[PDB]
């Protein structure tokens, strides 16, 4: 059986070029692909198939063996459309599972295969690339999870009737399961699900912890002109989100062309102004509601010393969530940045069940040379490169 | 000819290739084509058609006579195929062999069968003075058709496939109608393998030159001389004329530019000067004295021979870099001291605002990607920078930046941080509150400042903007100021640019500031929002708006 799939009207197959790969990787591909070839998963293609999609190799979490990874972003975006339990987000713990394996079992409408074409490069172009196209449902294709939904639910009902207290959500090649249970029973019971899943062909987050973090203002024994200026700056910005924020009293303390280091005693009025503002900030600005008809946006700023702040939002200054990320043991802005995006995407997946478009503070060249080297998810969000304003950073500190 | 499974071809969806009429030719050609064609007709190449064919491409006859056909039309209505790798092997990434033969198949396209189904579409015609009636169509890949290259290579790849699995000690390169074959076998063994190869191909209909007709090493490659164990940089000759047109000069530069990578010390600054304001390619420009000079110095340099070794997978790849001037970098990649695999030069990237550390970072990113392609590896770098400076730069810069494994090399001129901004205000140091503004309809602007010690100054500008004026103020401040300053501005723009400590730019203005900046002994720059009752700022806000 094969449900015919089609590209969005008037759209044509992807013709994305293959970035170069490390020796190590390439080999693993050649290795992996001969395997999938023998098993029929994929077949070699000719010069008449002009389409092409990028592929690479990764090692998810603690693994010596490589995993083939194909970047179907363009294909997905060109594939027709097909067709979220808030419960998920509101859980104690949530676990992710990799059901990509499941897709192999299903054949792909032969008429669509051509588009799935890809290439195993060679060093120094010394060799003609190894061209392939899938014969089954490929992992990463927005279309796979879909055509597989039917069989998915089936295999799921059981665990969903046995344990109708947990929530199982599927995104691409991932399965998200959440239970307010306790860990011991959680790590052991999840096992129960992978057991049930295993008799077919397959093989630790805390949502109640994600929110819109509070802006904190500096408190100091004494205040210099400089100190006060920087304060007013932050406050002034913050007034865009909280029009309740006032700076009159403080501005006054400044009236005059004094030295920058001059110490200024605060007025009872100014101290009130601060008091009042501190309070206006003890909570996230009212009326911030997520909109599904709109795109999620995740902005990240580099704070230095391995720290990174980020905000998820659809409309400017109306954050749905804001956060920070410290650094993973083992001096690499790119590993950190990559790790961050993955964290923020997963987190975005949980809550709204969709990936955010990233605005990365890095140069295209830099990011493209290495991100694939620390990537570890089965999915890939969208991203663009920017230049962090000097301000935006001081503010989220 | 050849018996390989033909490739399924189809015309771009919808499109179809109907008719570009025939170009009536003289009688000497109408028959000089009638001849050559009867030929191919027998060889099976072309097939006398007409039964049912509305399509047609025009034939031409060029000075021997020889025939040419215009599929120019046919092509644009032909589906697109999988591109012919235009990414190509660079000498520096080859593994030394004991021998390397080259087999020029020559007559190939005409050996590979055409997708029968599609042949009709190839129909073309031969004139006849009195047009009283010659219709043909190709049965094999047509010399000039869109898909001939892809369709051929692919067949090629399929024909070697066995052979290679059978002969892993042998290595084959397919380029155009060419095949480079090298190995580690002995002089006779290889010879014999070639022969095997040769006939194997004929077992498939692909003719190739024998041993007493094949070309001999070294082989010319995108500028190099390839010997199976080493390569030499083709000698580069520069003409000596009394007549140097613009054209002559450009091409020279073009040539010298290429040599800039292999050869050390090449210059074109003064030759380049000679094009300034040129009115025509055919124009003649007398070479200045300095020109007649570097050109000579370049000839001396160009005589030197550049020898090079290949890649040994059992040795470290190492890339060392040098700062040959601002924005200008030189690099050499070797495995054994002085035995270079590859060398190159990256020219001054002249943008809005950077610095060496940043520049160095991109140079490094560039070599890495080059390397991942050439060798599928990343060299261990040796950079003219101290881990401390890099540690200072990254640890404090706003953008994700990375440098793969590397090692400091104390080979000046070193890349450093020309200046650093204080992290806190400076005590006793004067304090300049600067500002500037410009109208959105006159582009008339005012820039100036007001400071604690009473000192001040305003100035008028014409044809400027908000950002140019704001910068202007900071400059003034940096001038009428002592060796330690505190500067407070309201321009997020000015700030950011400076917050990133630039040391090179294409703005005369910025450059000047930079200079000023490097001069000072202690600088702290600060920012305060625009139009508020913020001391000092509300003051200048009054002077730059009168
Ligand atoms: C032009 C070219 C491109 C790619 N590889 C090669 C060649 N030609 C050679 O002569 C050559 C020289 C040294 C090592 N490999 C070489 N060969 C390989 C085939 C033995």
Swiss-Prot record, chain B:
A motif (Tryptophan repeat motif) lies at residues 390-406. It is found in: Virion. Mg(2+) 2 binds at residues 435, 470, 490, 541. Changing residue 137 to M: Confers both multi-NRTI and multi-NNRTI resistance. Changing residue 113 to S: Confers resistance to lodenosine. Changing residue 100 to A: Confers resistance to nevirapine. The record marks 432-433 as: Cleavage. Residues 219-227 are annotated as: RT 'primer grip'. Changing residue 541 to N: Complete loss of RNase H activity. Changing residue 230 to T: Confers resistance to atevirdine and zidovudine. Changing residue 182 to Q: Confers resistance to efavirenz, HBY 097 and nevirapine. Changing residue 132 to K: Confers resistance to emivirine. Changing residue 95 to E: Confers resistance to atevirdine, efavirenz, nevirapine and zidovudine. Changing residue 182 to E: Confers resistance to efavirenz, nevirapine and quinoxaline. Signal peptide: none annotated. Multifunctional enzyme that converts the viral RNA genome into dsDNA in the cytoplasm, shortly after virus entry into the cell. This enzyme displays a DNA polymerase activity that can copy either DNA or RNA templates, and a ribonuclease H (RNase H) activity that cleaves the RNA strand of RNA-DNA heteroduplexes in a partially processive 3' to 5' endonucleasic mode. Conversion of viral genomic RNA into dsDNA requires many steps. A tRNA(3)-Lys binds to the primer-binding site (PBS) situated at the 5'-end of the viral RNA. RT is structured in five subdomains: finger, palm, thumb, connection and RNase H. Within the palm subdomain, the 'primer grip' region is thought to be involved in the positioning of the primer terminus for accommodating the incoming nucleotide. The RNase H domain stabilizes the association of RT with primer-template. Error-prone enzyme that lacks a proof-reading function. High mutations rate is a direct consequence of this characteristic. RT also displays frequent template switching leading to high recombination rate. Recombination mostly occurs between homologous regions of the two copackaged RNA genomes. If these two RNA molecules derive from different viral strains, reverse transcription will give rise to highly recombinated proviral DNAs. This is Reverse transcriptase/ribonuclease H. It comes from Human immunodeficiency virus type 1 group M subtype B (isolate HXB2). The gene is gag-pol.
């Amino acid at each position: 059986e094969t449900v015919p799939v089609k590209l969005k009207p008037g759209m044509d197959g992807p013709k994305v070029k293959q970035w170069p790969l490390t020796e190590e990787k390439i080999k693993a591909l050649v290795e992996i692909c001969t395997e999938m070839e023998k098993e029929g998963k994929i077949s070699k293609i000719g010069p008449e198939n002009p389409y092409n999609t990028p592929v690479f190799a990764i090692k998810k979490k603690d693994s010596t063996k490589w995993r083939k990874l194909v970047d179907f972003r363009e294909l997905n975006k060109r594939t027709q459309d097909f067709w979220h339990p808030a419960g998920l987000k509101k859980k104690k713990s949530v676990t992710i599972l990799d059901v990509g394996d499941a897709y192999f079992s299903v054949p792909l409408d032969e008429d669509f295969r051509k588009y799935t074409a890809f290439t195993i490069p060679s060093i120094n172009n010394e060799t003609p690339g190894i061209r392939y196209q899938y014969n089954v449902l490929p992992q990463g294709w927005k279309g796979s999870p879909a055509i597989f939904q039917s069989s998915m639910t089936k295999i799921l009902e059981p665990f969903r009737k046995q344990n109708p207290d947990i929530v199982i959500y599927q995104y691409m090649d991932d399965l998200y399961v959440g239970s307010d249970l306790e860990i011991g029973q959680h790590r052991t019971k999840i096992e129960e699900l992978r057991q049930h899943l295993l008799r077919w062909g397959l093989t630790e987050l805390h949502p109640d912890k994600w929110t819109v973090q509070p802006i904190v203002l500096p408190e100091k024994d004494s205040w210099t002109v400089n100190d006060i200026q920087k304060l007013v700056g932050k406050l002034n910005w913050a007034s865009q989100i909280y029009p309740g924020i006032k700076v009159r009293q403080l501005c006054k303390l400044l009236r005059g062309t004094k030295a920058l280091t001059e110490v200024i005693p605060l007025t009872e009025e100014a101290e009130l102004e601060l008091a009042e503002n501190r309070e206006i900030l003890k909570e996230p600005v009212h009326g911030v509601y997520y909109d599904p008809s709109k795109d999620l946006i995740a902005e990240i700023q580099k704070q230095g010393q391995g720290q990174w702040t980020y905000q998820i939002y659809q409309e400017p200054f109306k954050n749905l969530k804001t956060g920070k990320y410290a650094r993973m043991r083992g001096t690499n802005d790119v590993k950190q940045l990559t790790e961050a995006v993955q964290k923020i995407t997963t987190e975005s997946i949980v809550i709204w069940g969709k990936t955010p478009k990233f605005k990365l503070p890095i140069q295209k060249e830099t990011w493209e040379t290495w991100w694939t080297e620390y990537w570890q998810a089965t999915w890939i969000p969208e991203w663009e490169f920017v230049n962090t304003p000097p301000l935006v950073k001081l503010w989220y500190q | 000819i050849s018996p390989i499974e033909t490739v399924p071809v189809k015309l771009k969806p919808g499109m179809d290739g109907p008719k570009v009429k025939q170009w009536p030719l003289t009688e000497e050609k109408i028959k000089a084509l009638v001849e050559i064609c009867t030929e191919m007709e027998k060889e099976g190449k072309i097939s006398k058609i007409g039964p049912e064919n509305p399509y047609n491409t025009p034939v031409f006859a060029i000075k021997k006579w020889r025939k040419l056909v215009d599929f120019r039309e046919l092509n644009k209505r032909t589906q697109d195929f999988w591109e012919v790798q235009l990414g190509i092997p660079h000498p520096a990434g080859l593994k030394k062999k004991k021998s390397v033969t080259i087999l020029d198949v020559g007559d190939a396209y005409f050996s590979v069968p055409l997708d029968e189904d599609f042949r009709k579409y190839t129909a073309f015609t031969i004139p006849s003075i009195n047009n009283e009636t010659i219709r043909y169509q190709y049965n094999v890949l047509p010399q000039g058709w869109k898909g001939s290259p892809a369709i051929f290579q692919s067949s090629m790849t399929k024909i070697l496939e066995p052979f290679r699995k059978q002969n892993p000690d042998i290595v084959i390169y397919q380029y155009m109608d060419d095949l480079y074959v090298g190995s580690d076998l002995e002089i006779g063994q290889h010879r014999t393998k070639i022969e095997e190869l040769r006939q194997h191909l004929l077992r498939w209909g692909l003719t190739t030159p024998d041993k007493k007709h094949q070309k001999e090493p070294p082989f010319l490659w995108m500028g190099y001389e390839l010997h199976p164990d080493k390569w030499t940089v083709q000698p580069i000759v520069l003409p000596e004329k009394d007549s140097w047109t613009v054209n002559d000069i450009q091409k020279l530069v073009g040539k010298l530019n290429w040599a800039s990578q292999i050869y050390p010390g090449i210059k074109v600054r003064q030759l380049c000067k000679l094009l300034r304001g040129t009115k025509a390619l055919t124009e003649v420009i007398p070479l200045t004295e300095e020109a007649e000079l570097e050109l000579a110095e370049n000839r001396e340099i160009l005589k030197e021979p550049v020898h090079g070794v290949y890649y040994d997978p059992s040795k470290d790849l190492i890339a060392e870099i040098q700062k040959q001037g601002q924005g200008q970098w030189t690099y050499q990649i070797y495995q054994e001291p002085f035995k270079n695999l590859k060398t190159g030069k990256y020219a001054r990237m002249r943008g809005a605002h950077t610095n060496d550390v940043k520049q160095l970072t991109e140079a490094v990113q560039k070599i890495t990607t080059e390397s991942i392609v050439i060798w599928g590896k990343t060299p261990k770098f040796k950079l003219p920078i101290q881990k401390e400076t890099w540690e200072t730069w990254w640890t404090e810069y706003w953008q994700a930046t990375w440098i793969p494994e590397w090692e400091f090399v104390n080979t000046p001129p070193l890349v450093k941080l020309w200046y650093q901004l204080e992290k806190e205000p400076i005590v006793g140091a004067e304090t300049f509150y600067v500002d500037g503004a410009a109208n959105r309809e006159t582009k008339l602007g005012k820039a100036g400042y007001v400071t604690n010690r009473g000192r001040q100054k305003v100035v008028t500008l014409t044809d400027t903007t908000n950002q140019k004026t704001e910068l202007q103020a900071i400059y003034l401040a940096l001038q009428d100021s002592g060796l330690e300053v505190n500067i407070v501005t309201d321009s997020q723009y000015a700030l950011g640019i400076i917050q990133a400590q630039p040391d090179q730019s294409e703005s005369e203005l910025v450059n000047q500031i930079i200079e000023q900046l490097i001069k000072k002994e202690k600088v702290y720059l600060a920012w305060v929002p625009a139009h508020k009752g913020i001391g000092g700022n509300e003051q200048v806000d009054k002077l730059v708006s009168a």
